Amino acid sequence: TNPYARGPNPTAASLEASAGPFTVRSFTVSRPSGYGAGTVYYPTNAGGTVGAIAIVPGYTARQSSIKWWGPRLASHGFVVITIDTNSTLDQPSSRSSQQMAALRQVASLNGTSSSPIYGKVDTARMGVMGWSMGGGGSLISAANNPSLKAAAPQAPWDSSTNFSSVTVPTLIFACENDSIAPVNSSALPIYDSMSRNAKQFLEINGGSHSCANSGNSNQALIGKKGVAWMKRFMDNDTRYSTFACENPNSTRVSDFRTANCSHHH
């Protein structure tokens, strides 16, 4: 029935695993348009067109900090682009423009016969993710582009915490012990500002600012949640509603909040 549903019915184990059902390949963007550099991860055997997600790092950071998401998401049926910004010192508004530029390029590559992703993307179904300033940029992207299907920033920061205009379903990963972008002044005020969307707050117990980055020790949970969120909202895949909306009730989570996530008859 759902034309966007891909892959086998999910389980907790399947979502917690390092890899999803699909085989993944990647390429580096040869001529980046509007951003510094990019790597595109894609499924080779999805069975249908899939949505696209663009991920941006934090200040001073590069693709390495967020690269784990690429294969993790692509393996579940997404085309994911991780970027390096024009400057490592770019601010959130710039990061947002660059993130959108990356999504635009994925759309262009979907239409380029020589590309590995030719015809593999449903350009009408897109998502945004990012770390810190990149997370704030993801939120800026969502505010400015309400046709985006999902947002899942991690340890987000922006100069303004008021994201009241966001109508995109948004999952905020936070880190309890963050000293760069403290939860109390950053992630949580941002979460609280949003009253018009499906939203979720997931704080990792004892986490530093890099708690959701490559090499984190909570990939099973974090990966499960991120994929579930994207599946539920990018693909409208209600097979993932419990996973997306549930409170994990895990020692790894120190603070869980959610609103407007579950469907009511």
Q: Which residues bind Na ion (CB under 5 A)?
A: 33
Only one residue has tokens 């008021």, namely: 162
Residue 166 and residue 180 in contact, taking contact as beta carbons nearer than 8 Å? no
**Residue 114 C-beta: closest distance to Na ion, Å:** 19
Q: In this complex, which beta carbon is closest to Cl ion, that of residue 58 or of residue 169?
A: 58
Of the residues 65, 96, 97, 132, only one is catalytic, namely 132
157 annotated ligand-binding residue: yes
Only one residue has tokens 């390429």, namely: 27
**Residue 169 C-beta: closest distance to Cl ion, Å:** 27
DSSP 191: H
H-state helical runs in the chain: 12-16, 69-74, 92-110, 133-144, 187-193, 219-234, 241-245
**Residue 138 C-beta: closest distance to Cl ion, Å:** 20
230 annotated ligand-binding residue: no
Spatial strand order in the sheet of 253-259: 24-28, 37-43, 79-84, 50-56, 121-130, 150-151, 170-175, 199-204, 253-259
Residue 149 and residue 234 in contact, taking contact as beta carbons nearer than 8 Å? yes
260, interface contact from Na ion, Cl ion, none, CB < 5-8 Å by kind: none
Q: In this complex, which beta carbon is closest to Cl ion, that of residue 158 or of residue 178?
A: 178
Asked about 158 being catalytic, the answer comes back as: no
Task: Classify each residue of 76-93 as buried b or exposed e, where b means 16 or more C-beta atoms within 10 Å of its C-beta.
Answer: bbbbbbbbbbbeeebebb
**Residue 228 C-beta: closest distance to Na ion, Å:** 34
Binding site for Cl ion (CB under 5 A): 178-179, 208-209
Asked about 178 being catalytic, the answer comes back as: yes
Q: In this complex, which beta carbon is closest to Na ion, that of residue 85 or of residue 216?
A: 85
Q: In this complex, which beta carbon is closest to Cl ion, that of residue 73 or of residue 133?
A: 133
Asked about 192 being catalytic, the answer comes back as: no
Task: Please list the active-site residues.
Answer: 132, 178, 209
Binding residues for poly(ethylene terephthalate): 59, 133, 157
Binding residues: 59, 133, 157
